[PDB]
Amino acid sequence: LPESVSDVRFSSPQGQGESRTLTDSAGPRQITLRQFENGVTELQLSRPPLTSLVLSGGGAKGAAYPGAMLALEEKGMLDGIRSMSGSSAGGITAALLASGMSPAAFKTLSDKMDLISLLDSSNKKLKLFQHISSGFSELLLNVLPRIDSRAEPLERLLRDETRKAVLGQIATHPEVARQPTVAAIASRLQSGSGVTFGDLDRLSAYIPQIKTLNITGTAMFEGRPQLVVFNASHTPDLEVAQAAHISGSFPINVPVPEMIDKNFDSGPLRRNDNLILEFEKGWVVGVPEGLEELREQTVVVPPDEIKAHLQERLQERVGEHLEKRLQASERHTFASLDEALLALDDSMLTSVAQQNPEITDGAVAFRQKARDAFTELTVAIVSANGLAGRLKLDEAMRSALQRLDALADTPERLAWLAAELNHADNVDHQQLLDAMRGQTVQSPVLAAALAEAQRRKVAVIAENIRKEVIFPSLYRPGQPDSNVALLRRAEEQLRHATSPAEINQALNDIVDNYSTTVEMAKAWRN
Amino acid sequence: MIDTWLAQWGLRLPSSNDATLRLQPAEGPELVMERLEGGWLFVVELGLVPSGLPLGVILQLLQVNSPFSSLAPVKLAADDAGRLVLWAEARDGVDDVDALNRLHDRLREGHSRLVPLLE
């Protein structure tokens, strides 16, 4: 071997030699930890909770759908579903199920509901395309008020059935029904209003039978498909019946990955599994969820007698899929035991500690101190009554940060603490990060958290550019292969961008080589 | 044989037959090894293809693929995401330790000659 290739190591962790099992199937997630002669630690655990149901497409072919819901109910897994997502016509089904309809009720409705007739009837909802004459997704929303589709049979039906289901769930949970926010929702619905994405989000927190809803469609505008997304974050006050109706009326199948949400986290474990229902070699080397991972989560869907048949078939197929996923496992490899333990959420760590406290004592102490320090920080932030001023933060905040800094004794622990400080739902930590943005700070944990917050901000912008600029041109019918290649490359640049400069380079490469796409690129650049 | 080839560096093929392995020598590029049903795909990454390369550079890159190139049998390609790469295929039962070292050497030689051209 020549000089240059004298020493060689694996660049990612790889177990070497024999391993010992540190913990065997601990807790509900069946956590198994194996450690090798070189310290590399392998984590094996069950698949994550099945919390997302994804309905890819819909229409007439959806006659089999009731069988999938019956299968979920049969296996006691319907209550575990937290969110429903549907693309194009699949939004209709997603909306009904998300509203709390029972599998039995849904089957009855689906069977005597003529979706072909209801969709065909939809009397020209192309007025939308015309009103958009005077990005896109926001223009579409702004024009709905000057459109009247509320009385169209399909929308009236969805509005009535979703409302009935939601009101029924509320009524069966009297402790929930009497809560002021819920009583306000019920009153509004009883007055004739329809269920909104926001209503579902608020109620799902109280009643497991009600789920959050995501409806996505692709709308052809000027020969380019535009991704239109309806959910509690983007359109909280929009009636789900109208969203399902509009989404179902578009003429370009929404890629499944567009319905699976991106989740920033402090570790590598997948937060949850999806059950993807759809009808009927790529080569990326990367730097020094996949379709295959999605395939593992997908079940292909297959006149009264026929309905019964297709439903029976799907129920059998979904039932087997649910049994088989219980036999599957997730695997992760780490360079040290502590990093494997940091990948475990608090409940998982506790489960392992109950079986093998000798391997977790250090990690449990770290976790307890971190949680206590995070609380102290929150107390300091909220009790400060403002994080602005000539002097940076205050003594109480400094003290909390100092405790966190002391816990950051390894690069892995520093990274974990910084990611934990970035949780999007923590209003108080978020106020701290916003308050200190772009400033030099003494706390290494706060400094790392600020850097991570900036990287996340860039990733969010990159994702919007992908959806608004790249997606429409990438999936435009007739797009020459050379442009597709250019666009794929831009997608890669966007996936890896960590600074505004890297985003700008991606935009420049499109402007300089693409043969409105260029216009949108220049728009984002400035 | 791959395990014997790895043994040169005191390494062993990990028992968790994962589809992709990555090697990092003290000097030079990371070597990405992808398992092919009946062999291996050896790859070294050169970054995304830059915009605006001069014709001479484009020619030099394409010339790597000449059947008579000194880098033979290494090939220069771009992956689906536009990442420039040098690759070669190791076929089980045909390429011994010397053959594998030769592929690695050519991949490295190609990498060193080209990276500077991609500013």
Numbering used by the authors:
A (entry chain B): 55 to 188, 204 to 320, 349 to 377, 395 to 402, 413 to 426, 447 to 659, 673 to 683
B (entry chain A): 1 to 119
Question: From the publication, what sentences describe this entry?
Answer:
The cytotoxin ExoU, a 74-kDa broad-specificity phospholipase A2 (PLA2) and lysophospholipase, is the effector protein of this system that is most closely linked to severe disease. Within the bacterium's cytosol, ExoU is bound by its chaperone SpcU, which is thought to facilitate interaction of ExoU with the type III secretion apparatus. Here we describe the 1.92 Å X-ray structure of full-length ExoU in complex with its cognate full-length chaperone SpcU. The ExoU–SpcU structure is the first structure of a full-length type III effector protein in complex with its full-length chaperone.
Although both proteins are full-length, approximately one-fourth of ExoU and one-eighth of SpcU remain disordered. SpcU provided sufficient stability to allow crystallization of ExoU, but the remaining relatively large disordered portion of the catalytic domain is consistent with ExoU being catalytically inactive in the complex with SpcU. Although deletion mapping and co-transfection experiments had previously defined three functional domains within ExoU, our structure shows that ExoU has four distinct domains defined by differences in structure and function. In contrast, our structure shows that SpcU interacts with three of the four domains of its cognate effector. The chaperone-binding domain (domain 1) of ExoU is comprised of peptides from two distinct and discontinuous regions of ExoU: the previously predicted N-terminal region (residues 55–101; α1, β1, β2, β3, and β4) that forms the most intimate interaction with SpcU and, unexpectedly, a second region (residues 472–502; β11, α16, α17, and α18) with no previously defined function. The structure of ExoU indicates that this domain starts at residue 102 but actually extends to residue 471. Some residues of ExoU previously shown to be essential for PLA2 activity and cytotoxicity, such as the predicted catalytic Ser 142, the “oxyanion hole” (Gly 111, Gly 112, Gly 113), and Gly 286 are spatially adjacent in the structure, thereby explaining the previously observed phenotypes. The structure also demonstrates that Lys 178, which is ubiquitinated in host cells, is solvent exposed and therefore accessible to host ubiquitin ligases. The helices of domain 3 form a left-handed spiral, whereas helices of domain 4 are a helical bundle that interacts with the chaperone-binding and PLA2 domains. SpcU in solution and in the crystal with ExoU forms a dimer, which is similar to dimers of other class IA/IB chaperones.
